[PDB]
Design an enzyme around this catalytic site. Structure first.
Site, PDB file in Angstrom:
ATOM      1  N   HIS A 119     -12.874  -7.311  -3.997  1.00 42.58           N
ATOM      2  CA  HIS A 119     -12.765  -6.629  -5.281  1.00 42.58           C
ATOM      3  C   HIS A 119     -13.998  -6.810  -6.155  1.00 42.58           C
ATOM      4  O   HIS A 119     -14.213  -6.011  -7.073  1.00 42.58           O
ATOM      5  CB  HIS A 119     -11.522  -7.120  -6.022  1.00 42.58           C
ATOM      6  CG  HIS A 119     -10.253  -6.932  -5.253  1.00 42.58           C
ATOM      7  ND1 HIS A 119      -9.982  -7.612  -4.085  1.00 42.58           N
ATOM      8  CD2 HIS A 119      -9.185  -6.129  -5.477  1.00 42.58           C
ATOM      9  CE1 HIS A 119      -8.801  -7.240  -3.625  1.00 42.58           C
ATOM     10  NE2 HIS A 119      -8.296  -6.342  -4.451  1.00 42.58           N
TER      11      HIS A 119
ATOM     12  N   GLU B 237       0.817  -1.207   0.000  1.00 46.95           N
ATOM     13  CA  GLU B 237       0.000   0.000   0.000  1.00 46.95           C
ATOM     14  C   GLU B 237       0.854   1.262   0.000  1.00 46.95           C
ATOM     15  O   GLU B 237       0.462   2.271  -0.598  1.00 46.95           O
ATOM     16  CB  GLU B 237      -0.949  -0.011   1.199  1.00 46.95           C
ATOM     17  CG  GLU B 237      -1.858  -1.231   1.254  1.00 46.95           C
ATOM     18  CD  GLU B 237      -2.830  -1.304   0.089  1.00 46.95           C
ATOM     19  OE1 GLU B 237      -3.153  -0.246  -0.490  1.00 46.95           O
ATOM     20  OE2 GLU B 237      -3.276  -2.422  -0.250  1.00 46.95           O
TER      21      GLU B 237
HETATM   22 ZN   LIG Z   1      -5.103  -5.233  -2.671  1.00 45.12          ZN
END
Ligand SMILES: [Zn+2]
Ligand SMILES: *[C@@H]1O[C@H](CO)[C@@H](O[C@@H]2O[C@H](CO)[C@@H](O)[C@H](O)[C@H]2NC(C)=O)[C@H](O)[C@H]1NC(C)=O
Ligand SMILES: *[C@@H]1O[C@H](CO)[C@@H](O)[C@H](O)[C@H]1NC(C)=O
Ligand SMILES: *[C@@H]1O[C@H](CO)[C@@H](O)[C@H](O)[C@H]1NC(C)=O
Ligand SMILES: *[C@@H]1O[C@H](CO)[C@@H](O)[C@H](O)[C@H]1NC(C)=O
Ligand SMILES: *[C@@H]1O[C@H](CO)[C@@H](O)[C@H](O)[C@H]1NC(C)=O
Ligand SMILES: *[C@@H]1O[C@H](CO)[C@@H](O)[C@H](O)[C@H]1NC(C)=O
Ligand SMILES: *[C@@H]1O[C@H](CO)[C@@H](O)[C@H](O)[C@H]1NC(C)=O
Ligand SMILES: [Cl-]
Ligand SMILES: [Cl-]
Lengths: 197, 596
Positions: free
Chosen positions: B487, B357
């Site tokens: 997702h 991230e």
């Molecule tokens: Zn991810």
């Protein structure tokens, strides 16, 4: 001679002016203490050109001019001589031969609020660059296209003043900075702005 | 007065007006993803609508400047990107309904809880409650419960929403002259108008399928080795020719086999490279995890995290006071505001996730100088790949020694390489079939090749065939198991993670070459190598002002996605698996199921 210069009302005013309408105050016939002007913090900048800041406490000048306004952090570098950009070209311009100082400090705790503070404005379009120390407060529709605008904000006809969006969570480059530009002039008249010395 | 000068002036007004409107939308969206209340959904839709309406009126105005009279290339690129008429081609009712579906599925995913049949008032969220079970439980029935109750209680709620979600998304895509919503997502890789570098939307499917064939051998041998090691842990439940039970993989869905290391370590007597025990022993917290990742990016020449990052990010679960979206995400809110949202635990999987991230934030800060319309990744694959080329070096035993998670007298031999390469393959190689199969299902659903009744029929027919994973309980059309993943229920594209994996080794091959690394690729540590960071930063700062094909060649020398660096990285493990599978079957039967 004996009175004190009102630098407090310039550096520590409650609210500053927008850069497109920058405020100027003339300092005359007083004693100035330049070691106490502002609060020096991690972000404050003190840039002098053609004059030693460690010495002007022992210097005398005919008059002193203090220009104050608020500008984005990324654009504080534009308040110098020989700079370009939306601020140096359209809002405030220092001459290539500048003999003064530019003091700036971060004001994110004063000029930013949770909803966003949109009271500070800046000029985005202009048909020509500003001459040194020229001020333009005109609200007139900018003509970008070939057709005339006649005061109408339609297409290729833009309002020249945009608003700074100052949020407390902005990045350092998008945070408000208060700037004060000091101009020290010497004329054939006797000096009236001296330091304690 | 000229068309080009009118375009520059028009873009100047767009950049200064979109900066604040996009930031207000990001702020309202952050107040919801961290604090899930109905009031915050209202303000999120409000700031989002005013941003979509601003894009529509500016896109309409942008079309009045013909590109055929623009000699400037960067101006031509900004206008070309702005003239794409967005997700506001729907009616007001359908736009507010579609966003309601998206908002409903997102709240269900991050706030939906299942309650064990024994206690009706003691329930578990997916995070941290079912993720802890699917990652640390070795009981077949405890894992079967959490895997099934999550897909039966929460997954069935998403089924009617996702059906309407597909219909409205296709209408938005077909109104955009795309054949379906799947073709709309593949448009992120599209490149037009550049000689020698043009990439079509259909070319992605060809390159993904062609590259996947060259990965099957490495995966099939990894599949057979894990299946053999799983039989020793679940004796009466696993067939040596059958697919793998979905509830026995490292996580809720089988996306990563990372948590299967402790059960599949080749040489367990060697010092364990999983630093999870060392992190808890040294009393590390989420602050220490990100500060170490912050220190790693600085070692290669990249900047510190901004002061607002440490003040505004949410690096730990806020508790039961406010419901949050715990899935690790990075935020480029605009106006120099960078944040990371992650419910970090003290594990190595979260240690490498922090490097992932932060790779987004590091990429966001790089192209921040680009114009507003060019502040994006070269493609979705580049963005999720930046953090992973750092994880390759941050996971090596050499770097773990320097930070103090391995013993100072640790050694590099016959069996520490295979231990390390096996762990890396569980995370990197394991997700390649899981990703390709998942995105191919959505590509066919959006295209209309899969009717609504076979959704779960074709979903598990492809799980058995492509991924070699079988369902422990038979599911009918009432189940929506794709939507059980973040997702899918949060409207993200998933093929980004397939290209991410293949990109990250092409980049690592070029960065290790700039760092003058001698030897195998898996022993390369780009720590303290400003030459490596400079070669990467020169590409990150460009944003998407250059096509991803050209931007990739300027770093690795290839105009397209390639598999050779991926296989070269795992070649020492590939020959070792072929020897360990001489007494095992390489492949799987698409008929065996642990149920009748
Ligand atoms: Zn991810
Ligand atoms: C194409 O467009 C950009 C934007 O106008 C140009 O960048 C400008 O470059 C000159 C000098 O380098 C400056 O005076 C402009 O102010 C720059 N842009 C901005 C936004 O300030 C670029 O040079 C143009 N020309 C070509 C050939 O691409
Ligand atoms: C303005 O305020 C600062 C602290 O807020 C102080 O240090 C400074 O002396 C003040 N300026 C003047 C001219 O007194
Ligand atoms: C001057 O600046 C520093 C930093 O903010 C702070 O310690 C001090 O209180 C300030 N003084 C006043 C009076 O604002
Ligand atoms: C979460 O949002 C509610 C309103 O929806 C607000 O009252 C509350 O203070 C917020 N929580 C935090 C921690 O800001
Ligand atoms: C980055 O911030 C850390 C804070 O822990 C500091 O130790 C380090 O010196 C900073 N790096 C640079 C280059 O200033
Ligand atoms: C270990 O090393 C020996 C030689 O020292 C070699 O024959 C053997 O193949 C090695 N094993 C592995 C797993 O690399
Ligand atoms: C990298 O450099 C830092 C300080 O510059 C040092 O503490 C660390 O041990 C170095 N790591 C390696 C692997 O050389
Ligand atoms: Cl400077
Ligand atoms: Cl500028």
């Amino acid at each position: 001679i004996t009175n004190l210069c009102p630098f407090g009302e310039v550096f520590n005013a409650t609210t500053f002016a927008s850069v497109y309408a920058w405020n100027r105050k003339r300092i005359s016939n007083c004693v100035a203490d330049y070691s106490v002007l502002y609060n020096s913090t991690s972000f404050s900048t003190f840039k002098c050109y053609g004059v030693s800041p460690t010495k002007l406490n022992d210097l005398c000048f005919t008059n002193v001019y203090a220009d104050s306004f608020v500008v984005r952090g990324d654009e504080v570098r534009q308040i110098a001589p020989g700079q370009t950009g939306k601020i140096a070209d359209y809002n405030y311009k220092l001459p290539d031969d500048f003999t003064g100082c530019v003091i700036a400090w971060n004001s994110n705790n004063l000029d930013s609020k949770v909803g966003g503070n949109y009271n500070y404005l800046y000029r985005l379009f202009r048909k020509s660059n500003l001459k040194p120390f020229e001020r333009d407060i005109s609200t007139e529709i900018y003509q970008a296209g070939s057709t005339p605008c006649n005061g109408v904000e339609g297409f290729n006809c833009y309002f020249p003043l945009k608003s700074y969006g100052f949020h407390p969570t902005n990045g350092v480059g998008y945070q408000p900075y208060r700037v004060v530009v000091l101009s020290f002039e010497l004329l054939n008249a006797p000096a009236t702005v001296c330091g304690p010395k | 007065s000229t068309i080009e000068e009118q375009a520059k002036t028009f873009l100047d007004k767009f950049n200064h007006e979109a900066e604040d409107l996009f930031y207000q939308s990001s702020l309202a969206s952050w107040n919801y993803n961290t604090n899930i209340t109905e009031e915050n959904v209202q303000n999120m839709n409000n700031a989002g609508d005013k941003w979509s309406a601003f894009l529509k009126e500016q896109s309409t105005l942008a079309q009045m400047y013909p590109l055929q009279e623009i000699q400037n290339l960067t101006v031509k690129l900004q206008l070309q990107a702005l003239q794409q008429n967005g997700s506001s081609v729907l009616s007001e009712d359908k736009s507010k309904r579609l966003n309601t579906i998206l908002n409903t599925m997102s709240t269900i995913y991050s706030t939906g809880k299942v309650c064990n049949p024994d206690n009706p008032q003691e329930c578990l969220l997916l995070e941290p409650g079912l993720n802890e079970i699917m990652a640390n439980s070795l009981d077949y029935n405890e894992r079967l419960w959490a895997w099934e109750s999550w897909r039966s209680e929460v997954g069935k709620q998403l089924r009617p929403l996702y059906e309407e979600y597909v219909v409205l998304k296709n209408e938005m895509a077909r109104a955009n002259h795309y054949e379906d919503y799947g073709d709309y997502w593949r448009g992120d890789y599209e490149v037009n108008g550049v000689d020698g570098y043009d990439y079509s939307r259909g070319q992605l499917i060809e390159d993904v399928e062609h590259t996947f064939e060259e990965i099957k051998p490495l995966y099939e041998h990894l599949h057979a080795y894990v299946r053999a090691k799983l039989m020793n842990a679940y004796p009466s439940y696993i067939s040596p020719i059958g697919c793998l039970p979905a509830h026995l993989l490292g996580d809720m869905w089988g996306r990563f086999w990372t948590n299967l290391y402790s059960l599949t370590v080749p040489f367990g007597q060697k010092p364990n490279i999983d630093v999870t025990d060392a992190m808890v022993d040294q009393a590390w917290d989420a602050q220490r995890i990100f500060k170490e990742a912050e220190k790693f990016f600085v070692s290669v020449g990249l900047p510190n995290m901004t002061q607002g990052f440490w003040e505004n990010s949410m690096l730990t679960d806020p508790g039961n006071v406010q419901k949050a979206v715990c899935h690790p995400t990075a935020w480029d809110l605009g106006k120099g505001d960078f944040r990371i949202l992650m419910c970090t635990k003290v594990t190595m999987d979260d240690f490498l996730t922090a490097h992932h991230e932060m790779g987004h934030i590091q990429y966001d800060m790089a192209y921040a100088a680009q114009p507003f319309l060019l502040r994006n990744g070269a493609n979705e694959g580049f963005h999720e790949a930046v953090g992973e080329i750092m994880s390759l070096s941050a996971a090596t035993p050499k770097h773990l020694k320097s930070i103090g998670l391995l013993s100072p007298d640790f050694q590099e031999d016959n069996e520490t390489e295979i231990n390390f390469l096996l762990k890396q393959a569980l995370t990197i190689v394991g997700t390649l079939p899981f990703t390709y199969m998942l995105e191919k299902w959505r590509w066919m659903v959006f295209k209309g090749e899969i009717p609504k009744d076979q959704w779960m029929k074709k979903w598990w027919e492809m799980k058995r065939e492509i991924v070699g994973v079988v369902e422990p309980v038979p599911h009918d059309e009432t189940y929506c198991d794709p939507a059980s993943l973040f997702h899918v229920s949060n409207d993200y594209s998933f093929i980004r993670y397939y290209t991410r994996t293949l990109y990250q080794f092409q980049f690592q091959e070029a960065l290790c070459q700039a760092a003058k690394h001698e030897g195998p690729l898996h022993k390369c540590d780009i720590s303290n190598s400003t030459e490596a960071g400079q070669k990467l930063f020169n590409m990150l700062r460009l944003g998407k002002s250059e096509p991803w094909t050209l931007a990739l060649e300027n770093v690795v020398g290839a105009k397209n996605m390639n598999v050779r660096p991926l296989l070269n990285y795992f070649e020492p493990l590939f020959t070792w698996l072929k020897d360990q599978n001489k007494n095992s079957f390489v492949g799987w039967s698409t008929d065996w199921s642990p149920y009748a």
